[PDB]
Amino acid sequence: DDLVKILVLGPSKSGKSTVTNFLAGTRDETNPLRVLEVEIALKAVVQLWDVGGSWPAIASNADGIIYVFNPEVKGSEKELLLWYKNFAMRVTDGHSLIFSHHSSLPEFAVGDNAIPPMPKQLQGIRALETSLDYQSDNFKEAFDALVEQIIASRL
Ligand SMILES: [Mg+2]
């Protein structure tokens, strides 16, 4: 029943924990750190680690990362490179996600990139437009699929 460790980084006020609870199961002012535990299998117990911005001892044998940023907000696309820098040494490789996340009515995000243009280091990681109420992709599926690719080659 070997667990998989997935972290959650990104700009503050971006939405990281509304995703964690929705993903980890918790139904429906930011804290340093939470850990949520969701088991998703096909015993695969998955651990969402919701981080709050300002401790490189937290990437211990980390397996995957999910970045969240508000597209309507500037520097959000660019703050994530500090998360990229501070954590992925190169701890994490490719088993990552990036969320253009609507917490608001999309004014800028809308259009030809409702996932706005990404920096070069991050242009390689799969990206989605994301919301619980506004326009959305089935990102429960992309999360489901991330755990399989993580465990896929640990053996
Ligand atoms: Mg929070």
Curated annotation (Swiss-Prot):
Chief location of this protein within or outside the cell: cytoplasm
Keywords noted in UniProt: Cell projection, Cilium, Cytoplasm, Cytoskeleton, Flagellum, GTP-binding, Nucleotide-binding
Subcellular location: Cytoplasm, Cytoskeleton, Flagellum basal body; Cell projection, Cilium, Flagellum
GO cellular component, one term: cytoplasm
SS bonds (residue pairs): none
GO molecular function, one term: GTP binding
Sites where the protein binds GTP: G10, P11, S12, K13, S14, G15, K16, S17, W49, D50, V51, G52, G53, S54
Organism domain of life: Eukaryota
Record bears the keyword ATP-binding: no
Record Pfam families: Roc
InterPro entries: P-loop_NTPase (IPR027417)
GO BP terms: cilium assembly; intracellular protein transport
Keyword DNA-binding: no
Similarity annotation: Belongs to the small GTPase superfamily. Rab family.
Function in brief: Required for flagellum formation.
The protein, known as: Intraflagellar transport protein 22
Gene: IFT22
